[PDB]
């Protein structure tokens, strides 16, 4: 995150960590106890399926404060619509192999219905992105947690304002600022995009893609969650299948 | 379409019925109040809460 500052402890406490062979990965969003929402591209590179960990109640990587709950990640499960290497489709869900117990550190983010999401949810204009991603382009990443609170624009005035670069579809939304002073960056993929509406937090968006970060000319891509909802739901509802990956129909 | 303007005046979930008919209702952990829009924690640790800045 460039330009935001650390979430007081507890202050997020839906945000995921994601480590593989104990490595910082991604990031990602509790919505229920045993069910994580991360971005598809974390995924690309694993080999190690075995070594995926998910860490609940996280604030300081440097030390460990009791806090903290990790469990192994049983299912990731992908959009069949999704390409590795590409930005289409960017999410994934995540279920653990043993659910995270609720504390004051481990809370869940609301996962909204569609209809409130689109009618509601989407026209409110700020909303708070999280992580121990990068701190600055091409700079270290953060020992603490990090959140910026970032303005969410129409896709039209989003390709207007800015400045190769892949198309900006129905399935993400533009967020963040032009002038190059704050943005989510690449060690952030997978986390929340999480928005207020009368006194509770949900899930609008997934720490996606860009150019760099907070680079000039250009905002942050979010997957739009809205387009997910029934099928997170309906997978929720599925009983878990051998192997970690699970490619799954989209719609 | 009552759920479309302000939310139906829900808290959280609005459903559209036949007429002039709306129903409001909650995400799990939460019970709907008897004024038909609010939404209450059922539950210690129900979603989209702080709880630090609950407790608060
Ligand atoms: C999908 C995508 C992601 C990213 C860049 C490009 C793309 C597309 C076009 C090509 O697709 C890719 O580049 N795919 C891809 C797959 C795996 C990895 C991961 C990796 N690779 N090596 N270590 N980690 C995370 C697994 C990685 C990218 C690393 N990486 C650059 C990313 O995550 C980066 N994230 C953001 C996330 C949010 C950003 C923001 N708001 N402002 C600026 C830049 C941002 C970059
Ligand atoms: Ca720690």
Same mark, same amino acid.
């Given at each position: ?32 106890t045993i069910w994580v929402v991360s ?14 960990? #998910? ?6 990587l440097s030390e460990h404060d009791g ?13 069949? &619509? ?7 489709? !960017? ?11 609720? &504390?004051?550190? $481990? $809370? ?13 949810? #989407?026209?409110?204009? %700020? ?42 579809? +129905?399935?993400? %939304?533009?967020?963040?600022?032009? !002038?190059?002073?704050? !943005? ?10 999480? &928005? ?19 680079? $000039?000319?250009? %905002? ?9 909802? +029934? ?14 990956? =699970? ?5 | ?14 459903? !559209?019925? &036949? ?12 019970? =709907? ?9 059922? $539950? +210690?640790?129900?979603c989209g809460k702080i709880p630090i =800045? +609950?407790?608060?």
């Amino acid at each position: 995150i460039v330009g935001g500052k650390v979430c007081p402890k507890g202050e997020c406490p839906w945000q995921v960590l994601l480590l593989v062979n104990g490595a910082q990965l991604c990031g990602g969003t509790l919505i229920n106890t045993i069910w994580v929402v991360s971005a598809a591209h974390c995924f690309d590179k694993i080999k190690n399926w075995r070594n995926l960990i #998910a860490v609940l109640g996280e604030h300081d990587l440097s030390e460990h404060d009791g806090d903290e709950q990790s469990r192994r990640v049983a299912q990731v499960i992908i959009p069949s &619509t999704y390409v590795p290497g590409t930005t289409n489709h !960017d999410i994934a869900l995540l279920r653990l192999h043993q659910p995270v117990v609720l &504390t004051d550190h $481990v $809370v869940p983010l609301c996962l909204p219905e569609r209809t409130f999401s689109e009618r509601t949810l #989407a026209f409110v204009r %700020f909303s708070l992105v999280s992580g121990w991603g990068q701190l600055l382009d091409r700079g270290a990443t953060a020992l603490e947690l990090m959140v910026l609170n970032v303005p969410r624009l129409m896709t039209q005035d989003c390709l207007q304002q800015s400045r190769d670069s892949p198309n900006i579809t +129905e399935y993400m %939304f533009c967020a963040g600022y032009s !002038d190059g002073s704050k !943005d989510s960056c690449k060690g952030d993929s997978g986390g929340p995009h999480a &928005t207020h509406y009368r006194g509770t937090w949900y899930l609008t968006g997934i720490v996606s893609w860009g150019q760099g970060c907070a680079t $000039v000319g250009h %905002f942050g891509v979010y997957t739009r969650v809205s387009q997910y909802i +029934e099928w997170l739901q309906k997978l929720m509802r599925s009983e878990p299948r051998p192997g970690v990956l =699970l490619r799954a129909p989209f719609p | 379409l009552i759920c479309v303007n302000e939310n139906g005046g829900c808290e959280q979930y609005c459903s !559209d019925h &036949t007429g002039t008919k709306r129903s409001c209702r909650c995400h799990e952990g939460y019970s =709907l109040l008897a004024d038909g829009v609010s939404c209450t924690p059922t $539950v +210690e640790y129900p979603c989209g809460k702080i709880p630090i =800045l +609950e407790k608060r």
